[PDB]
Each structure stands twice: as C-alpha cells, then as structure tokens.
Amino acid sequence: GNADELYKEXEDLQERXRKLRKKXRS
Amino acid sequence: GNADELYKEXEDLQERXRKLRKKXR
Amino acid sequence: GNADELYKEXEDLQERXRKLRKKXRS
Amino acid sequence: GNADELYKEXEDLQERXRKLRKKXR
Numbered sequence: 001g002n003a004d005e006l007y008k009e010x011e012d013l014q015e016r017x018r019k020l021r022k023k024x025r026s
Numbered sequence: 027g028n029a030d031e032l033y034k035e036x037e038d039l040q041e042r043x044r045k046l047r048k049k050x051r
Numbered sequence: 052g053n054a055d056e057l058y059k060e061x062e063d064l065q066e067r068x069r070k071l072r073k074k075x076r077s
Numbered sequence: 078g079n080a081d082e083l084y085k086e087x088e089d090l091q092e093r094x095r096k097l098r099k100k101x102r
C-alpha cells in the first residue's frame with residue numbers, strides 16, 4: 001500500500017470502466 | 027433500469043475515481 | 052484531498068455498489 | 078453479456094476498492 005499502487009489501481013480501474021462502457025453501448 | 031442508466035452510472039463512477047486521482051496529485 | 056476524504060469516498064462507493072448489485076439481481 | 082456478468086464485475090470492482098482501503102490502513 002503506497003501512492004504508486006493507489007495511482008496505478010485508480011488508472012487501471014478507470015480504463016477498465018471506459019472499456020466496459022464502450023462494449024455496453026455496442 | 028436500462029442500459030442508459032447503467033452507462034451513466036459507470037461514467038459517474040469513473041469520473042469520481044478521476045476526481046480522487048486529481049485531488050491525490 | 053486527504054486520507055479521510057479517500058477513505059470516505061472509497062466506503063461510499065463500496066456501499067453504492069452493494070446497493071446497485073442488490074437491485075440489479077432483484 | 079448478461080446480468081450475471083455485470084453482477085460479478087461489480088462485485089470484483091467493489092472488492093478491489095475494499096483491498097485499496099485495507100492496504101491504505
């Protein structure tokens with residue numbers, strides 16, 4: 001648990017959500 | 027209770043996470 | 052931006068997701 | 078591409094957030 005882990009997880013989750021939103025509409 | 031509602035929900039959650047990242051930095 | 056805000060947001064989002072999962076199945 | 082898949086996805090995202098909170102504390 002550190003700033004780099006928090007940042008990486010937050011950015012991975014945001015990208016996972018962009019992909020999920022994209023496929024949901026398609 | 028449709029795809030549009032889930033889509034808006036997902037965008038809202040994504041932007042709440044971006045706001046945490048921006049505040050953290 | 053601080054530890055209390057991060058904690059509160061993470062806990063609010065988890066609870067919002069418990070409610071969304073609950074209503075999705077129902 | 079059904080409700081079961083979205084349900085598992087949502088549980089996965091929720092548990093990933095609990096893991097960040099636990100690591101933070």
Ligand code: NA
Nearest residue numbers: 007008011047
């Ligand atoms: Na970046």
Ligand code: NA
Nearest residue numbers: 058059062098
């Ligand atoms: Na608590």
